[PDB]
């Protein structure tokens, strides 16, 4: 096998489905499978779209290059790079550690999360563990996005805003969720805990409310990953946020989107006047949620088997405003939970 | 000390200078000073370009707000965060380490680099840390950019090309440098572990040579930072790689570029085809050079004391091709070492 077979394949997935699959995708999928015949595992290594990776495969087995039986085999030495393992082991890869917030935030938030509610499948729920929470407010910690600041957080099912109100910092939280369970967990624990956070029911299809244009120094979110998904989430932090100096956190994935997706949110990103400047992939990592046999890719599946450990996984940027982002305050009209690459839905 | 006179003390210096000083650079200046008393720390804990902070260090002195003398002492409450301290210790907030690299390549790039040219003035050099070389290989290695690849490296003080060579990895490693010493060393170290890396003598001002032109899949630089010191360095690099899925490494400062040039450097990547995958701030430490006290910025500061420790620091970018780069491959006119935010010339 060589590097047209690469080529070819991803043509043919192409020709398909209409997505920008590209020979790289073809590589990744291989070298993922050189270190395992787990699909679970195959999947977070890969980092290509569960969408993507179910046709390759398929191509690949129609050439005689896989075995598809309770597993992914490799049948053919191939040229694709092996998976690194270069990861520090202390922060999982991430270069943050949740342990070290102040207010003995992670050991506080530790017990809460244990009664937290379970993911369900009408909010494209899933959260990330705790230690991936943790980190992610650590690294507004050290970017000095917390103190003294007024955070916005976009869905909180990582329970993110619980963290960032745990450790003392910031003026106040408020988060925004679609689900009332998260709502009032959320206020559960803010009042028992005497924190500055409050929690609204609100549904981000619908516009911001006026309260919330332009009166945040910080926002979180996780979002679905539409072009819908980003105007319904990052578009509407931007506008929530006062303007230059202002800081975003955002979830974003490559189960669920293509690197010409990446390309597509980053340009989204610079023509508004954002600017990146962290980008840690691979830094969240997500508990298994109950739902996923009822998703849309499980039909799909080559190898059908519930997973038993952390596959999904999502890169964290940080996005700071170099001007007030003026963007419209509309409606999202089409499906929000059916993007062209999803999969978990 | 309310937020309108961080806006007055950045709108006082973006007059004076012409350059994008704005009040979260402010913020951030006096939020490093709420932590340190040392002017190298506080310069690493800014994230402000040190041309920024010299007059944001004067306009603070000049309102009453900070104390100079043998120390930086700041003589007021005010509105700004103190930086977090949740990077983790194990890898110095990296996520990666060099330890796992193939090869023992870890342990034998240490012994080749206590032989190190040192660095000096003439080409801008500052050598980073052996494992903060060793780590930004080890992110090549974990995205699959060194295994039977072609690499090349565009400037090389950092030795990474010794570094990626030691791996035995990439099908090949070639190194340019105008420095003859950088491009001796590498020979002879090439000669003696028997790898298949070649260095060669040459001004990236000058014309990318046509053997060179898409010719590799991954590129590693840490360039000058003007807009032509982007130009020699990274899109000579963009040009020589062969296109599509291919990747790029590339380290980018604080201390030397403002988040307005961030911004700039990120349009130039999306709108030549690039998108970014990894962007960690902070990744390389810097080694202490030589000629500090002829250094630009030396007689501006405003204590002068040989830095004891390290300061200087950049971020570790990946970058990948979705589509071929056509960039010119023209010579850069001007003054390559007299950027407007420069200040360690
Ligand atoms: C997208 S999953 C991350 C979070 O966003 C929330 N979420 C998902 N869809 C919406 C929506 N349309 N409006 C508001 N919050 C949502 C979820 O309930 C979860 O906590
Ligand atoms: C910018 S410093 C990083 C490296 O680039 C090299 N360098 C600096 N200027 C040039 C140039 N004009 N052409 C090629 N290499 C350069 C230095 O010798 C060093 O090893
Ligand atoms: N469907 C469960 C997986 C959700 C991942 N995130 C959506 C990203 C892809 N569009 C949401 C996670 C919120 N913590
Ligand atoms: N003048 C000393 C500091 C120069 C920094 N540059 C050194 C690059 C080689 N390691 C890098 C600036 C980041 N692009
Ligand atoms: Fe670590």
Known sequence: VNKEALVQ???????????????????????????????????????????????????????????????????????????????????????????????????????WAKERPEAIQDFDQGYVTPESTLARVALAWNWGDLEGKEVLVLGDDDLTGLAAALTGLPK?????????????????????????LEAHVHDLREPLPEAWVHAFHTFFTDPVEGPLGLQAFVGRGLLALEGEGCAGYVGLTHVEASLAKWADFQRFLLENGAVITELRDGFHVYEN????????????????????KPWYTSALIRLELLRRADLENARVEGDLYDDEESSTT
């Open 9 to 111: 394949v991803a043509e043919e997935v192409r020709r398909a489905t209409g997505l920008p699959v590209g020979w790289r995708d073809v590589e990744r999928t291989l070298g993922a499978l050189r270190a395992t015949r787990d699909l679970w595992e195959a999947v977070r290594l890969s980092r290509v779209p569960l969408r993507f990776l179910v046709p390759i495969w398929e191509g690949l087995a129609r050439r005689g290059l896989l075995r598809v039986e309770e597993g992914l085999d490799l049948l053919a030495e191939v040229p694709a790079p092996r998976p690194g393992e270069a990861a520090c082991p202390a922060c999982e890869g991430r270069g943050l550690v949740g342990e070290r917030l102040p207010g003995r935030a992670a050991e506080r938030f530790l017990a």
């Open 172 to 196: 106040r939280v408020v988060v925004l969720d679609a689900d009332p369970r998260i709502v009032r967990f959320l206020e559960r624990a803010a009042k028992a805990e005497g924190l500055p």
């Open 289 to 308: 949620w109950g739902y996923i046999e009822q998703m849309r890719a499980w039909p799909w599946l080559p190898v059908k088997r519930r997973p038993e």
